[PDB]
Amino acid sequence: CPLMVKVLDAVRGSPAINVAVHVFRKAADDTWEPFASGKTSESGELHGLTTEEEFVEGIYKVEIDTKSYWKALGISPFHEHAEVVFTANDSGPRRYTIAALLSPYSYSTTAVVTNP
Amino acid sequence: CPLMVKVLDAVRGSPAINVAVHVFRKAADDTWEPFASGKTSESGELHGLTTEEEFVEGIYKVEIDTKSYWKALGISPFHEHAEVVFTANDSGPRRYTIAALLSPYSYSTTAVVTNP
Amino acid sequence: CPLMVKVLDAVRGSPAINVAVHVFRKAADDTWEPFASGKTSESGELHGLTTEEEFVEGIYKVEIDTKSYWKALGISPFHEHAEVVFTANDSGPRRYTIAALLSPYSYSTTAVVTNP
Amino acid sequence: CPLMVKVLDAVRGSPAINVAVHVFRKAADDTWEPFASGKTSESGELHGLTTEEEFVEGIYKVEIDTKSYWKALGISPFHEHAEVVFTANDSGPRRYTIAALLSPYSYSTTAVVTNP
């Protein structure tokens, strides 16, 4: 997969299921254009956002809708969302995994980048 | 001091010094308007961003310019910046510390919200 | 898998490959008895440590040999190892994933626990 | 103050107050001998563990009793405790801050090592 998003819940020790994720790409006029979106599965994973052909060079933003996730579990969390902003594919195609671990007042995020 | 930002470096085991930090407040037209900014001190801290009178309820974004920090250290990083987006909420007196721990391909962030 | 260990490198944005992992189980005399060991694969994963039958109730320690990992990459890190100590299977068999994200002066660890 | 421990709570967005912390120093027979201990303050901090004269080079372990902390909050946790194991190294003057951010199924820890 060229782009995969994985979200975990540090309170429950589980994948974070049904988390909305929106991806944007910076356009030539410097605005954030919608690129792809989806929801995490029962494994906390979101696959199928894009294809190698579509996922050209650019600056991308992955917005993870953490507030809605916590609210539905009865928690009023600190953050509106978790955002991950990065340049992709500027030295040719890569595969990106964006992972996030969520707590009500914190999050950690990392990237795993591999060359296919 | 109702808002403080603290930035640490997980590669060097040190405060992240001279990191640019920009704070924005969401306007009624849903755009981000500049609110305060500065550079972290030798302790990785940025104080004096705002006052109690000015820091009213609303949605705020703290951008930390991590890419320029890593570039200055000669280390290739993943993210363009780290972003922390949250709502300020008057529920009694409040002080907010936004902390971030930086690595080249990762960051962790937390909020410590206390009442003096 | 009843027990899986996954290790990532926050400096390189990659799995942490060839990391030694030692698992211990607390014995009746309160000493740490060797239980299983192995090394992470090219995907940063270590599978096959134990079986559902062997992995009885108990207190377990997963020791990840982070210092050796960093030293081989030219970094003199802070920690000797990362240790994860937990009670397992005390409400019946579960599947455990122990994940760790490594930096030279930091680590983050989480657990994902699922009921088969 | 050559050694300070700071503990934060990612569920409540607060310092982790009244957490027991035990420090050990590895003896020549390779056992862990008690060195210092205390409970975190209302700021999540534990100062006064040791002195410059006493804190000689060696291998130290900081155990943070996270399970009892979560139990007191009525939250089921994963870990028995969080452990931080490191070597103290005289390379000019040094102060060590060991910080930990706690969630029920996760923890993050970093070291900030500075020269005053």
Ligand SMILES: O=S(=O)(O)C(F)(F)C(F)(F)C(F)(F)C(F)(F)C(F)(F)C(F)(F)C(F)(F)C(F)(F)F
């Ligand atoms: O530097 S301080 O010890 O004052 C601190 F505020 F506690 C802190 F270390 F920065 C921190 F807030 F704990 C912290 F940096 F956020 C931290 F939580 F400890 C951390 F471990 F670094 C971290 F969790 F990774 C985070 F910074 F949140 F990313």
Ligand SMILES: O=S(=O)(O)C(F)(F)C(F)(F)C(F)(F)C(F)(F)C(F)(F)C(F)(F)C(F)(F)C(F)(F)F
């Ligand atoms: O490899 S997977 O993406 O399936 C994963 F195990 F979930 C993971 F990526 F390793 C992960 F656990 F999510 C993780 F990336 F390590 C993570 F939890 F998100 C993490 F952010 F790296 C982390 F929180 F720091 C962890 F180190 F796992 F605690």
Ligand code: NA
């Ligand atoms: Na290029």
Ligand code: NA
């Ligand atoms: Na039982």
